[PDB]
DNA sequence: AAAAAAAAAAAAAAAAAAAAATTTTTTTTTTTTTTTTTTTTTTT
DNA sequence: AAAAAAAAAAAAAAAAAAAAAAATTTTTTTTTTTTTTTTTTTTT
């Protein structure tokens, strides 16, 4: 049979084509359809808030009835992109829609998702837990008869959550006169297929409760969108799977979520670019360049008083240096690592949490919160296919980002021996019997530690005040000392500022573009750094009662280069000048020399 | 593929807004609401007067629009209803009671299932049919084929058979033995299975049986008749036999067609699924009937000297025989049927044309057959045996005489008929009945027909009322006149213009019916003169006659009074009757 | 185990014709809890019901 | 399971697209396409000899395996007629391909339709036997759901021959929500369907053996092209049928012949002309219009001598008069009817066999071969529906045709009176209790009676010597008397003619073993059919002069003085004789292609009757 | 050096899925047979 | 020429052949979820 008339379907496609047109009203979806055409994509994404704004009743129909309205939507998109382009619409055979925006009662978690939302469009929060091996499902299978020289093509359809009989899912193996066929794999069509398992986000679940999880199904251009441990938010259709041919049914209908869209946490917001953003950042770059770093570091973490040099170093780690890779295969890392250490109540954890709130891909961890295998990667067994499997630790997740360690001194020594890999290479050489690997874990480490004896002993050398060895302090590019100086004006200003704060976005834009920027250094700066490091590498550099803090090394020179390049990234000059070199010299001097 | 709600509003617009200014359909709607009218006939010419494309849609898709028109008029009745119906019929009482109790227990806000409703045809008490558009051309039963299925064809043909009005179920009604709620089962198929269990909400909730029983009392029936119509001879192709269509009649269209008449049916051609058969071809075949929406009877089944004027207008092709024409016109008009104590006397003339060959006996006979309102024609052995009488098919269906009952039977080659057919004809002449007592049949059929006979040269003289010798003998002048007449006919395809044009056959049948409905008396004054004339002819014959001769004179005199159209039998009437008898004698 | 919809003059539907249309059902939640005898209510020597 | 490409189908469709492509050739099939598009007919008839000469291999392939091959042919036809006119090609969901030509090995008869010819387009002549009611078959059925304002179109595949499944045969009645669906009969689509039964002809069949017949399923386009009794040549696909489902089968496969086309095997509806032949007839008429009747009359029936008046009269019959149906349906006939009465060995039966071989739709009736109910029509019940059907008789078959009555004298009085209304009005009004009708048989009758005593006695009057009533001899409009004078002189005449025809041979075609307007004037001695066929249609009206003259001559004939004593009338002069005069005058004028009957034709008619009727009995 | 956390491997149980499966009876159709009517044919 | 007798025709009823029509859940398997035990690796 074929439907000739359908008021619902016809009006659905009419309303959709009207909505997706949008050229006369602000061109939102005209721009989006042109964008996916030019970018060669066929899964549009549609703001349900705008759909409600235009045709609210259509929106309610869409939400409360998913499969019918979505089929109507995707076919209307097919016709619309057919109008705007011909060969493209012919090339791509079916144009999907995904949904997005605010889904008031339907924006749920795997706990609150009851059967009330069956056949409806839900928006489920929560982490990912499983990610199946991606597999092609056959959708248009071509065969060639060797004897007859004729080619056929059986077809299939997405009978995922509808009635399915054996006739649809037969696959040819014989010709009509018993002349066995040969399948043409390349001429056929295929659709990758993955299945993940969302779980209620571990914090948001009520305490002492075994968590609730919901299965999710993924198809073309959605398979490798979320690995395990992703803070995903899946918008999709919640439905029932038919238990195949029965003769006795308990009535227990298993359920899934056919995902019509997949998103990560919004923090990784590299695309947020616009005319106002470029205008203001160009103003900032051009009208002032001799105090970009000073002003930015000053306004970095306004809540905490002082810490001028330490905050400047935080900004140095945040921007980073420049990863210098060599033709031979050598790689000299571009990322600074910092160890705050100081008296209690000197905002060490607050600087850490500041980085965690602001930076992209910033991972918290506390001293004995993660023990080894958590911090670096680990190797588990699949336990179904027998093979090994790699479980990415905090550092691996934090690759090209930052890890903030709190209670670093109270972190076990074994963990620090583990991060001996990462603190210079950015790579973890995990290995067990069945799998060897070399995982890119290239990420900065900010750390906080309290000194031995609970509080910093003012009248002892830093090597005696720190419970860490020359090796570890060398792996850290920067070590910083903070002491509560109890001077009267100091106490006055710190308490005044604290009470004042008891009574940004441009920075977020600036940081990642500056990270993108890759300056190069001048010969003036090169000679200057060579002779400055030579000055430092000398007993004459230090003096009695002013002991060094960390064992000065070629690492110290290299991290001075990273600091200078970082200041160049701040200045947007693409030229590490003597200004940057001098500033890095001042920073390393203050960080590396402390009195006794 | 049109919005049927939109078209429903348009048919409402047409029904309400049509005028001619009297609001034809508005008045019919008032009559409907009062229940002074059980069937409404829509006129597609009237539809096309404003919306021809609507007529196009109807004709290409009829039964759908029968349903839509019916529903629209049902919806429109309360708008025009003025006063309460008098509840004429038990059906009307039933619909009033059902409306009462549903309005009683309605719960107006509440919503109910689609099946907890009165079937839409159960409450109508009005039929709706279409009168086909004049723009459509009347088809032919061979040409009406599969591409006309579901379409409003217009066809013409002779009705050869029709069953008697039987009651047909349209909505069976049942009553539970538990919940006291009626149940209704509509009917579309020719046959059906009757329900067993009750779907009433109370029965299902209590989980009792509710084995409902069928009620012939609270159900709806409609009169149901079926007729077998067939092609005229003239529109058959050269070699073929005429083809037949099974027309189905129901409602106020029944009891119109009878076996023999010529009809034009506007009807929806439709299929019926074929079940209980083992054919070759797969798929779905279908016996096709014709739902009849408008039956009409067409053609023969619809001035002091008026006698001579009408008499000379019978069969103007044939030359001469003017007095035979006068006698034939009397045979058509008839005399009177008087009702005395114990006896009944037929009032029908019988005429026999005994003649030499080539005197157009058969032409006169055929002209009478086509002219007469209810007529039949037999030629020798074409219709013998049970062709004149009735045979059982079971059902008893009439031959030529029974068809010509209350009419005219035109028999050709009277002398050459079979002995049995001659005997049956004699009984029909004597008593206007046929008393069959064969193996399968025991019957006394009522065959009231004037008999017109043709033959070429005692029983005939004794039986018949008028017997006319028409013998040709050569003559120079008269054969010149006949030759001139017939050759003018062969030139101009028309009679030679007399002083007055011959009158049309339609007006002829009209005047014959008007004269037939004008039964006059024989006075008391004229008994003397008519007795005198009868006794006089007895003297002359003594120097064949009998009481049949007096009855022939009387019947002819009454027929002459009928034709004269006024007053009672008179001297001139008896004079002309005796003149016709004397000219039969001179023959 | 029988398609009731009988069409005349045609072979019948097969023996076990029915497949459970999942799109068109009404479904409601259900939870299978485990209850245990109140520990005070348990007798001295007895495992909880 | 849509096929991407098949070399076989692609090749066949290309070959037949070439075959239809007729411009570099004379344009025959292109012209056929254009005329059928103009007609609105949707079958094109392709000659198998054409297909064989252009590609013998495709002819072999098609005549060995029809249905898919003809699917290719019909798809090519649809593409081709779309190129000529896409708008018309869109009109019909399919177009069809009839066949014609020399089906050499594929010409058998239903006795010889063995099991070797399955899926092969077989050619078969035979007589129809049945005519099932032409009833619709649904192909594309539309439905409307009023609850959901929905419409559906279930689709059906004509698997009359292949395997058919219930899933294909479902007629929907409820939606997915168990709502009620109402069929849309008008919006649906149907095709007619009829079964018939061809039979081996009894003239062809073995003498002592039972009949053998084959079933033929005429779908649309071939509804009423075959009634019972007709001669028909059916060409089409013998196949097998599917037994309805069920776990058991015997091997039996009742078989049919899904006819690809059926044509009238009589081969007597033959107006086949060319423009040159039309011009030939036109000049033949106009150049010598005044002598053309005698030209035709002398021409007609060669291989017989003299009887020139009878040849003129049989021309008057065959050319026919003109039927007249006046304002009120008073139908005055326009056929001649001739009674040959004459001594034995006067070629009367030879004239009858001549008109049998020549006149289209001629049929023989013997004295006691055919009889009454056989001669005229009949009424009989069905016994499958208890309904009265009508069985058309010999005369009704011969409607607008000729019947040759051999030994008319021997038909008993019952049939001799049963022929009365067909003789005059050309109709048979039959009726029994169920059904009545007036079957129309506008026939013409050439009847060869023989005299009483076995040979005419010269001295006895014709009325004594003919064993036939004046009643009937009125209805006959001409009675021609053929005596064997037995004189040696005319015997020399007839004898030399007869033995010359015994000496005439097939020219050149034979060696000694036994079995154009004008003719090449062979010393020892087609267009007849062409000219008389065109002649039949003209309605030459009578002039005033002709009507007055014919009237006066009829009055003279009626008057007794016109016959001298010693002559005896052969047929009494009723008004039928005047109408005879008019009809013979019209037939002569039709011979002339006059467009008006003039005094020439009138005096020829009066000459005809004066010779025919009044006989000189000698003492 | 002892404790313990994790890993892999092994087993039990509940839910879903898999698999197995001709025979008897009824109805159309065809074909003859028989009755009774009609028709035709032979006799006085 | 019409009556009597016989033959054939028409129509209803019956007997067999062969193709259609109808009825028609229960037991076993086995994957998946869960728990349990012995061991090695790691931490106190
Ligand atoms: N320089 C400072 N200015 C303002 N507040 C400070 C400063 N140093 C410490 N604090 C306050 O101390 C509190 C806790 O300090 P925290 O970050 O826990 O240090 P630690 O990790 O040494 O305990 C915070 O509420 C923070 O505001
Ligand atoms: N008086 C007349 N006028 C016109 N036509 C006549 C007349 N008499 C005879 N005929 C013609 O003679 C023809 C034969 O007559 P017909 O109907 O056979 O009489 P019947 O049947 O008694 O022999 C008819 O076509 C008729 O028109
Ligand atoms: N007029 C004639 N001209 C030539 N030959 C004739 C003629 N009449 C009779 N014959 C011959 O006499 C034979 C008579 O045959 P046929 O016509 O069958 O018998 P009948 O003449 O008794 O009907 C024919 O074969 C024919 O050869
Ligand atoms: Mg702290
Ligand atoms: Mg007559
Ligand atoms: Zn009930």
Ordered DSSP codes for D96-159:
EEEEES--STTEE-GGG--TT-TTSEEEEEEEEEEE---EEEEEEEEEEETTTTEEEEEE----
The β-bridge partners of D615 are: D568
Q: Measured in Å, how far apart are chain D's first and last C-alpha atoms?
A: 98
**Side-chain half-sphere CA neighbours of C28 within 13 A:** 0
Instruction: Detail the protein residues whose CB sits closer than 7 A to any atom belonging to strand F.
Output: A 247-248, 368, 371-372, 412, 414; B 278, 392-393, 419, 440; C 1-2, 6, 9, 11-12, 15-16; D 243-247, 250, 252, 373, 378, 380-381, 383, 386, 388, 432
Of B188, B2, B70, the closest CA to residue D144 belongs to B2
Between the CA of residue D596 and those of B483, D41, D288, D326, D507, what are the distances in Å? Answer: 19, 38, 16, 19, 42
Minimum CA–C1' distance nucleotide for A246: E17
Strands A378-381 and A362-366: unpaired
The total of other beta-carbon atoms located within 10 Å of residue D556's CB is: 15
Size (chain C), residues: 49
The whole-angstrom separation of Cα B498 and Cα A495 is 141
**What residues contact D509, with CB distance under 8 A and at least 6 apart?**
none
The angle at the Cα of B102, spanning B100 to B108, to the nearest 5 degrees, equals 120
**Cβ atoms < 10 Å from Cβ of D405:** 26
The answer, yes or no, to whether any atom of ligand 1 lies below 6 A from the CB of A54, is no
Going by C-alpha positions, the residue among B357, B367, B360 that lies closest to residue B321 is: B360
Strands B407-412 and B396-397: unpaired
Provide long-range contacts, Cβ within 8 A and 24+ apart, for A419-424: A419/A375, A419/A376, A419/A395, A419/A445, A419/A475, A420/A471, A420/A475, A421/A376, A422/A376, A422/A395, A423/A337, A423/A475, A423/A476, A424/A333, A424/A475, A424/A555
Q: Which residues of chain D make contact with B380, given a CB cutoff of 8 A?
A: 417-418, 420-421
Residue pair D214/D124 in contact (Cβ under 8 Å)? The answer is yes
What count of other Cβ atoms lies within 10 Å of the Cβ of residue A72? Answer: 24
Is C11's CB within 8 Å of D176's CB?
no
DSSP, collapsed to helix, strand or coil, labels residue D83 as helix
Cβ pair D590, D320 in contact under 8 A: yes
Q: Pairing mode, if any, of strands D96-100 and A213-218?
A: unpaired
The tokens 């030209």 sit on which residue?
A: D295
HSE-up of D331 (CA within 13 Å, CB side)? 17
**Beta-sheet pairing, D231-240 with B213-230:** unpaired
Is there an atom of ligand 2 within 6 Å of B319 CB? yes
A11 CB within 8 Å of a chain D CB: no
The structure was resolved experimentally with cryo-EM
The answer to whether the CB atoms of C24 and D166 lie below 8 A apart is: no
Of A166, A6, A168, which is closest to residue A71 (Cα–Cα)? A6
Sequence-ordered strand ranges (E) for B48-199 = 127-131, 152-162, 166-175, 182-186
Q: What is the C-alpha to C-alpha distance for residues B147 and B288, in angstroms, rounded to an integer? A: 12
The radius of gyration computed from the CA coordinates of chain C, to the nearest angstrom, equals 25
* Backbone angle region of D583, left / alpha / beta, with phi > 0 → left and psi within -120 to 50 → alpha: alpha
The reply to whether B579 touches chain C by the CB within 8 Å rule is no
Helices A7-21 & A67-84 angle (0-180, nearest 10): 50
- Is residue D98 within 8 A of residue D74, CB to CB? The reply is no
Mutate to test the pocket of ligand 2, among B358, B377, B382 (most ligand atoms within 8 A of CB): B358
Considering only CA atoms, which residue is closest to atom 4 of ligand 3? D304
Q: Which residues of D431-461 are buried (b: 16+ CB within 10 A; e: fewer)?
A: bbbbbbbbbbbbbbbbbbbbbbeeebeeeee
Give backbone dihedrals phi and psi of D190, rounded to 5 degrees, phi first: -135, 160
Residues of chain D immediately before an interruption (C to N > 2.5 Å):
515, 525
Q: Cβ–Cβ contacts within 10 Å for residue D151, how many? A: 20
Report in angstroms the alpha-carbon separations of D324 from B428, B490, D352. Answer: 36, 7, 27
Measure the CA–CA gap between D139 and B283, rounded to whole angstroms: 8
Long-range contacts of A107-113 (CB under 8 A, 24+ apart): A109/A200, A109/A201, A109/A204, A109/A212, A110/A198, A110/A199, A110/A200, A110/A211, A110/A212, A110/A213, A110/A214, A111/A200, A111/A205, A111/A211, A111/A212, A113/A212, A113/A214, A113/A238
Do B209 and B198 form a contact (C-beta atoms < 8 A)? yes
Q: How far apart are CA A472 and CA A419, in angstroms?
A: 9
Strand partners, A127: A199
Number of H helices, E strands in chain B: 18, 18
CB atoms C25 and A243 under 8 Å: no
Chain B residues inside the 8 Å CB shell of D440: 233-234, 236
Of C1, C19, C25, the CB nearest to A165: C19
Instruction: State whether the beta carbon of B384 lies less than 6 angstroms from ligand 2.
Output: no
Dihedral (CA of B143, B147, B148, B149) sign: positive
Give, using CA atoms, the residue closest to atom 24 of ligand 3: D347
Quick check: CB of A449 below 6 Å from ligand 1? Answer: no
DSSP secondary structure, D27-71, as one string: -HHHHHHHHHHHHT--EEEEEHHHHHHH-HHHHHHHHHS-HHHHH
Q: How far is the CA of B176 from the centre of ligand 6 (A)?
A: 5
E strand residue ranges, A343-470: 362-366, 378-381, 388-391, 402-406, 427-428, 439-440, 444-449
In whole angstroms, what is the distance from residue A237 CA to residue A224 CA? Answer: 19
Alpha-helical (H) ranges within D300-424 are: 308-319, 348-358, 394-397, 413-418, 420-424
In this structure, the strands spanning B213-230 and B244-250 are: antiparallel
Strand partners, D337: D445
For A145-254, strand residue ranges (E) read: 151-155, 182-199, 213-218, 233-240
Residue D129 tokens, joined: 């036997």
Tell whether ligand 1 has an atom less than 6 A from the beta carbon of residue A455. no
Dihedral angle, C-alpha A530, A534, A536, A537, nearest 10 °: 130
Tokens, residue C39: 């520990």
Maximum Cα–Cα distance across chain B: 104
Half-sphere exposure of D60 (CA within 13 A, CB side): 3
Distances (CA, A) of B4 to B54, B79, B341, D144, D495: 12, 21, 66, 10, 87
The span from the CA of D258 to the CA of D70, in Å, is 13
Gaps in chain B (C to N over 2.5 angstroms) fall after 20, 302, 393, 457, 543
Does D149 sit within 8 Å of A2, measured CB to CB? no
For residues D182 and D143, the answer to whether their CB atoms sit within 8 Å is yes
Q: How far apart are CA D239 and CA D231, in angstroms?
A: 23
Residues in C touching A247 (Cβ below 8 Å): 1, 16
SS3 B433: strand
Task: Name the closest ligand to CA B358.
Answer: 2
Residue of B363, B367, B416 with the most ligand 2 atoms within 8 Å of its CB, for mutation: B363
**Helix, strand, coil fractions of chain A, as percent rounded to 5:** 35, 20, 40
Query: Radius of gyration (Cα) for chain A, nearest Å?
Result: 30
Angle at alpha carbon of residue A438, lines to A434 and A441, rounded to 5°: 135
Q: What is the dihedral of CA D464, D469, D471, D473, to 10 degrees?
A: -70
E35 closest protein residue (CA to C1') = B439
Q: Which two tokens stand for residue B257?
A: 């067609």
Minimum CA distance residue for ligand 3 atom 19:
D345
Phi, psi at residue A144, to the nearest 5°? -130, 130
What is the C-alpha radius of gyration for chain D, rounded to an integer number of angstroms? 30
Residue whose CA lies nearest to ligand 2 atom number 5: B318
Task: Provide the 3-class DSSP secondary structure of residue B584.
Answer: helix
Straight-line distance from the first to the last Cα atom of chain A, in angstroms, rounded to the nearest whole number: 92
d(CA B184, ligand 6 centre) in Å:
12
C5 and chain B: CB distance < 8 Å anywhere? Answer: no
Which of helix, strand or coil describes residue A471? helix
Q: Are strands B166-175 and B286-297 parallel, antiparallel or unpaired?
A: unpaired
Question: Please, which residues bridge with residue A44 across strands?
Answer: A97
CA distance A385 to A380: 12
Q: How far apart are CA A103 and CA A106, in angstroms?
A: 5
Percent of chain C that is helix, strand, coil (3-state, to 5): 0, 0, 100
Look up residue B347 and give its two tokens: 């009032």
Report the candidate in A558, A38, A76 with the shortest Cα–Cα distance to residue A336. Answer: A558
In whole angstroms, what is the distance from residue A323 CA to residue A424 CA? Answer: 12
Which of B369, B355, B337, B544 is closest to B451 using CA atoms?
Answer: B369
| Nearest nt by C1' to B392 Cα | F11
D567, D573 in Cβ contact below 8 A? Answer: no
Distance CA A282, CA A270 (A): 18
Give the C-alpha separation, D191 to D134, whole Å. 10
* Sign of CA pseudo-dihedral B138, B140, B141, B142: negative
- Rounded to a whole number of angstroms, the CA Rg of chain B reads 30
Provide the sign of the torsion angle of the four alpha carbons D590, D591, D594, D596, taken in this order: negative
Q: Which of A77, A63, A62 is nearest to A8 (CA)?
A: A62
Helix orientation angle between D599-612 and D308-319, rounded to the nearest 10 degrees: 120
Spell out the long-range contacts of B546-555 with Cβ–Cβ below 8 A and sequence spacing 24 or more: B546/B462, B548/B462, B548/B463, B548/B465, B549/B581, B551/B345, B551/B465, B552/B349, B552/B465, B552/B466, B552/B581, B553/B577, B553/B578, B553/B581, B554/B335, B554/B522, B554/B530, B555/B334, B555/B335, B555/B336, B555/B347, B555/B348, B555/B349, B555/B465
Q: Which residues of C are less than 8 Å from B286 in CB distance?
A: none
Ligand 4 centroid, distance to A357 Cα (angstroms)? 17
Is A253–C21 a contact, with Cβ atoms under 8 angstroms apart?
no
């Amino acid at each position: 049979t074929v439907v000739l008339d359908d008021v619902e379907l016809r009006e659905a496609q009419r309303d959709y084509l009207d909505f997706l047109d949008d050229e006369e009203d602000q061109g939102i979806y005209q721009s989006k359809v042109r964008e996916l055409i030019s970018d060669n994509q066929y899964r549009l994404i549609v703001n349900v808030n705008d759909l409600r704004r235009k045709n609210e009743k259509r929106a309610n129909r869409l939400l409360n009835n998913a499969f019918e309205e979505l089929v109507a939507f995707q076919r209307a998109l097919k016709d619309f992109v057919a109008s705007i382009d011909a060969t493209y619409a012919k090339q791509y055979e079916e144009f999907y829609v995904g949904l997005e925006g605010s889904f008031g009662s339907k924006h749920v978690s795997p706990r609150t998702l009851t059967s009330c939302f069956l056949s409806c469009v839900v928006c489920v929060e929560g982490i990912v837990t499983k990610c199946s091996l991606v597999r092609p499902k056959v959708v248009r299978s071509v065969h060639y008869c060797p004897a007859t020289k004729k080619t056929i093509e059986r077809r299939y359809s997405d009978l995922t959550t509808l009635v399915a009989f054996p006739s649809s899912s037969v696959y040819p193996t014989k010709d009509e006169e018993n002349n066995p066929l040969e399948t043409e794999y390349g001429l056929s069509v295929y659709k990758d297929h993955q299945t993940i398992t969302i779980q209620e986000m571990p914090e948001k679940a009520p305490a002492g409760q075994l968590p609730r999880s919901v299965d999710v199904i993924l198809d073309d251009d959605l398979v490798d969108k979320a690995k395990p441990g992703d803070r995903v938010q899946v918008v999709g259709t919640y439905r029932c799977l038919p238990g195949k041919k029965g003769g006795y049914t308990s009535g227990t209908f298993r359920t899934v979520l056919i995902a019509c869209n997949v998103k990560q946490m919004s923090k990784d917001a590299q695309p947020s670019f616009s005319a106002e953003d470029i205008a203001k950042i160009k103003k900032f770059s051009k009208t002032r360049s001799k105090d970009i770093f000073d002003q930015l570091a000053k306004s970095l973490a306004p809540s905490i008083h002082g810490h001028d040099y330490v905050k400047k170093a935080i900004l140095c780690l945040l921007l980073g240096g420049v990863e210098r890779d060599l033709e031979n295969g050598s790689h000299i890392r571009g990322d600074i690592n910092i160890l705050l250490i100081g008296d209690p109540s000197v905002a060490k954890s607050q600087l850490l949490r500041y980085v965690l709130c602001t930076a992209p891909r910033a991972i918290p961890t506390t001293g004995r919160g993660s023990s080894g295998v958590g911090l670096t990667a680990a190797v588990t067994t699949d336990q179904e296919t027998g093979e090994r499997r790699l479980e990415a630790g905090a550092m691996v997740l934090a690759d090209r980002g930052v890890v903030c360690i709190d209670e670093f001194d109270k972190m076990s020594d074994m963990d620090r021996t583990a991060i001996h890999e990462v603190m210079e290479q950015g790579r973890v050489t995990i290995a067990k019997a069945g799998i060897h690997a070399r995982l890119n874990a290239r990420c900065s480490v900010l750390a906080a530690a309290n000194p031995v004896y609970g509080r910093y002993d003012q009248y002892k050398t830093p090597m005696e005040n720190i419970g860490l060895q020359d090796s570890l302090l060398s792996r850290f590019d920067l070590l910083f000392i903070m002491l509560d100086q109890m001077d009267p004006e100091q106490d006055r200003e710190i308490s005044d500022h604290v009470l004042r704060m008891h009574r940004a976005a441009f920075m977020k834009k600036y940081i990642h573009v500056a990270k993108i920027i890759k300056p190069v250094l001048t010969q003036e700066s090169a000679t200057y750094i060579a002779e400055e490091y030579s000055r430092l590498r000398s007993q004459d550099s230090m003096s009695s009662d002013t002991a060094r803090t960390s064992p000065v090394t070629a690492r110290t020179l290299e991290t001075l280069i990273r600091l200078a390049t970082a200041h160049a990234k701040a200045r947007m000059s693409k030229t590490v000048d003597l200004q940057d070199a001098e500033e890095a010299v001042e920073l390393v001097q203050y960080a590396y020399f402390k009195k006794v | 593929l049109k919005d049927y709600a939109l078209e429903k509003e348009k048919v409402k617009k047409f029904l309400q807004e049509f005028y001619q200014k009297q609001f034809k359909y508005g008045n019919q709607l008032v009559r409907l609401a009062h229940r002074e009218q059980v069937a409404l006939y829509v006129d597609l010419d009237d539809v096309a007067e404003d919306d021809p494309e609507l007529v196009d849609s109807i004709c290409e898709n009829a039964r759908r629009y029968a349903k839509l028109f019916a529903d629209a008029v049902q919806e429109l009745l309360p708008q025009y209803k003025e006063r309460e119906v008098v509840n004429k019929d038990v059906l009307d009482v039933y619909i009033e009671h059902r409306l009462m109790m549903e309005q009683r227990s309605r719960d107006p806000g509440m919503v109910r299932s689609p099946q907890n409703q009165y079937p839409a045809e159960l409450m109508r008490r009005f039929e709706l049919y279409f009168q086909g558009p004049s723009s459509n051309k009347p088809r032919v039963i061979r040409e009406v084929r599969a591409d006309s299925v579901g379409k409003l064809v217009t066809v013409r043909g002779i009705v050869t058979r029709v069953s008697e009005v039987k009651p047909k179920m349209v909505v069976a009604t049942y009553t539970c033995d538990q919940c006291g709620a009626e149940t209704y089962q509509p009917i579309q198929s020719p046959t059906f299975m009757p329900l067993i269990m009750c779907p009433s909400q109370e029965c299902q909730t209590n989980r009792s049986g509710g084995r409902l029983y069928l009620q012939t009392r609270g159900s709806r029936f409609i009169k149901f008749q079926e007729m077998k119509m067939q092609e005229h001879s003239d529109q058959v192709p050269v070699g073929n036999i005429p083809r037949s269509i099974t027309v189905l009649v129901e409602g106020e269209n029944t009891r119109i067609a009878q076996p023999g008449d010529h009809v034009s049916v506007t009807g929806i051609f439709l299929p019926i699924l074929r079940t209980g058969f083992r054919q070759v071809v797969q798929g779905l075949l279908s016996e096709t009937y014709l739902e009849a929406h408008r039956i009409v009877k067409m053609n023969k089944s619809e001035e002091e000297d008026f006698y001579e004027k009408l008499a000379a207008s019978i069969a103007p092709e044939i030359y001469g025989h003017e007095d035979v024409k006068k006698a034939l016109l009397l045979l058509l008009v008839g005399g009177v049927d008087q009702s005395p104590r114990g006896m009944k006397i037929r009032g029908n003339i019988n005429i026999c044309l005994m003649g030499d060959p080539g005197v157009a006996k058969s032409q006169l006979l055929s002209y009478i057959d086509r002219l007469a309102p209810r007529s039949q024609y037999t030629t020798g052995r074409g219709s013998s045996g049970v062709g004149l009488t009735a045979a059982v098919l079971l059902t008893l269906e009439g031959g030529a005489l029974v068809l010509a009952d209350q009419g005219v039977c035109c028999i050709d080659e009277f002398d050459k008929m079979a002995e049995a057919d001659r005997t049956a004809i004699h009984e029909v002449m004597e008593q206007q009945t046929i008393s069959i007592a064969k193996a399968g049949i025991l019957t006394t059929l009522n065959a009231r027909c004037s008999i017109l006979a043709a033959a070429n040269p005692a029983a005939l003289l004794s039986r018949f009322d008028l017997l006319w010798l028409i013998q040709d003998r050569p003559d120079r002048d008269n054969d010149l006149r006949l030759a001139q007449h017939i050759t003018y006919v062969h030139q101009h395809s028309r009679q030679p213009p007399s002083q007055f044009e011959p009158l049309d056959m339609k007006l002829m049948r009209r005047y014959i019916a008007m004269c037939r409905e004008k039964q006059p008396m024989v006075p008391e004054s004229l008994a003397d003169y008519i007795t005198a004339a009868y006794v006089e002819m007895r003297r002359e014959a003594w120097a064949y006659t009998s009481a049949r001769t007096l009855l022939a004179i009387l019947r002819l005199s009454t027929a002459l009074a009928r034709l004269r159209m006024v007053d009672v039998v008179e001297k001139e009437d008896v004079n002309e009757a005796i003149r016709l008898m004397e000219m039969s004698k001179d023959s | 185990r029988k398609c009731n919809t009988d069409q005349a003059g045609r072979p019948k539907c097969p023996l076990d014709p029915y497949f459970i249309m999942p799109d068109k059902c009404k479904c409601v939640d259900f939870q299978t809890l485990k209850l245990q005898e109140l520990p005070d209510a348990v007798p001295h020597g007895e495992m909880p019901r």
